[PDB]
Each structure stands twice: as structure tokens, then as C-alpha cells.
Design an enzyme around this catalytic site. Sequence first.
Site, short mmCIF file in Angstrom:
data_model
loop_
_atom_site.label_atom_id
_atom_site.label_comp_id
_atom_site.label_asym_id
_atom_site.label_seq_id
_atom_site.Cartn_x
_atom_site.Cartn_y
_atom_site.Cartn_z
N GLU A 1 -17.98 31.97 -15.56
CA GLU A 1 -18.06 31.97 -14.18
C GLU A 1 -19.69 32.07 -13.62
OE1 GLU A 1 -17.61 35.71 -11.54
OE2 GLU A 1 -15.55 34.70 -11.44
N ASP B 1 -12.31 27.85 -14.34
CA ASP B 1 -13.34 28.10 -13.53
C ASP B 1 -14.91 27.61 -13.80
OD1 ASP B 1 -13.18 30.74 -14.06
OD2 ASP B 1 -13.77 31.27 -11.76
#
Length: 378
Positions: A64, A125
Site C-alpha cells: 500500500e 490495493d
Amino acid sequence: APNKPFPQHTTYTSGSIKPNHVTQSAMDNSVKAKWDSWKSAYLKTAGTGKYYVKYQSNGDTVSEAHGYGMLATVLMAGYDSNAQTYFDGLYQYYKAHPSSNNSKLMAWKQNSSFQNIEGDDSATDGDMDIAYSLLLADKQWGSSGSINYLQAGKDIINAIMQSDVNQSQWTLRLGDWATDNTFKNATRPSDFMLNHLKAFQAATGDARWANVIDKTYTIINSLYNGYSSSTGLLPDFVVLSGSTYKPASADFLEGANDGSYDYNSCRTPWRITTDYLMTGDSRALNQLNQMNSWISAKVSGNPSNVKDGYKLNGTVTGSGGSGAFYAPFGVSAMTSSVNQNWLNSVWTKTAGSSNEGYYEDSIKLFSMIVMSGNWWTY
């Protein structure tokens, strides 16, 4: 020289607003100042030819964080004359940490010696932001140099579809490990980066991305009406039970607030609004507008009163202020001129804030890029 140098002064969809109590140059300079402070705190060398993002005090990282570094470095080119060196170094770090399930995705967590820890599977993500950052790099610098950004980007995008997308349901998985009966149909709303997905379709021609966009808007609206009709808030995790997507129950994956608006979902007003801003796509507009209405009333228009967690019915769960939570509401406020004062308040809070930590400071920085009118896409 960079093709889309900061600041780009992007025109967002008609009827959207930017802060209007400060000048455009004061906004641009605030972003510049936040970028310098972000890199000073978080952007570190990682052995020769490599950079990484320090997400915690002890020097560990996660994918991330990596993808936020990649995204920011490409957006800040034009201002930061070393942007491409940083980006390239971050690229090489990503290439050295392949997921154990799909070699184009990224192993999600390393220790401070850059060894994989806590399992070497991907996180969707981080994968998505790395992928999107490579499409932006192709726009920013071209793909003719030592790294073919466009091709690297296509390769990861195709891997996301292969391994991080549930192609039975057209939902984004939590990561390339999330294939068993408990987790295969679950999804994280902070991954609903609808405008990244449009960029993925544009780069690859794969309309499966359109299937995922379509399904994801349907889920947003189902959860909104069913579970958060007075707030617009989306839960940290979503599960499929029977016929219907629902909020996850406590301790599904991370903690007690897994079915509430917490440290994952605090990003949704940023990630979802960006599609509207960029395209005019109105399929989450009612949801985003409800959020704007609810939050600005909840806090009496004072961003210092936003707390780091809420139940979907709007009950406070958080114990403190957090830029991870107020700053994304600034972005969603951009949907309508009725929020002008609230948007200006969020702007002022965000730009005037101190460094809080990697997560909060990253989210404030992107929110500021967006609010200042400097976000752009592939």
C-alpha cells in the site's frame, strides 16, 4: 522533461468545486510543501538503485505504502526534479518483491531489511496503485527509456485481473490469497478505485474491467441504501451472504470495526469521488452527496471534530481526530457547490496540519492534490 508537470490545473467535471477562500498558487505551494515533508519522513533508500516507503517507525513497509510512493512521485514530477529517479527506484523495489502467487503482483509486507514477512501474498490495493502509477509514468515520461512503463503497467494490470479479481462475481479480491470459501467473495470498499479501473480498461482493452466497475457501483449503492442510508458510509469489509452484499461482522479479518467505517474505508470518499471528478460518471453521486450532507452536519462544519471511526449509522467509534478521516471528506465535498464552506474548512485543516504519520500524511497529500485541482489520469 515531464509531459504533465505539477501543477496540471485539471478541469474536473461540471458542477464540481475547488476551495475558493485561498488562491490557486497558495494551494499549489501547499501541496509542494506537503510533498517535501512527506518524502523527508517516508521516502528512503533501499540498497542501490532502490527506494521504498517507511510505513512505520521501525522501518517496515507494505505494498500500500509502496504504491502511494509510486503514485506521488509521478504526480509530483515537474516540481521535484528527482521524481523519475525516485519512481524508478521504487519500481525496482517492487520488481524485487514478487508475490508468491503471481509474480507480477507485490509481496505485501517487508521488514526493515526488505525481507518479506507476514506472508508473501499480495494486497489488491497496493497492486492497483502500482499498476496505475505505471500508466501515469507512461504519460509523464514516455515508455522509451530504460523502463517500458506502459508494458510494465499492462503486465501488472493483467495480473490483477488474473489473480486479484473474482471473475465469477466481478469483484476485487482482498488479495491474491483470497480464494477460499470464507474470503473469495469478500471485497474492501477502499479498493473501489473506479477511475483506476477505467484506466486499466483503456490500457488493455479488457472489458472485464467494465464488468468490475459495473458490479462495484451496484455494490456501493446496495450497501448505501441497505446499510447506510442516512450517512453514505461504506464498511471496511464487505461479504456476500446469499443473494446480497453486506457489511462484514466483527473480527472478520482485522478487528472489531470490520463492518464499520474505519481505517480502511476512510479512503472511500477520496477513491470513489475521483471517478466522478474525472468523468462525470454519476453512479455513486447520491451516496457521496449523502456522505457530504451527513458529515458536515455531524461535525457542525468543523473538520477538527471528525473522528477516526464511525458506525454505518453515524455513531462515533473513533477516539481522536485524524487527517486520514477528514481529508478524504474534503474530496467528496467537491461534488457540489452547496459544500463550498465545508470544503474550504477541510482544505484549511489539511494544509495547516502537522505530520501525523505515514498513513494520515499520505491520505492528506493525495486529498490535497485532488482538492487543489491537480489530479489527472491516464
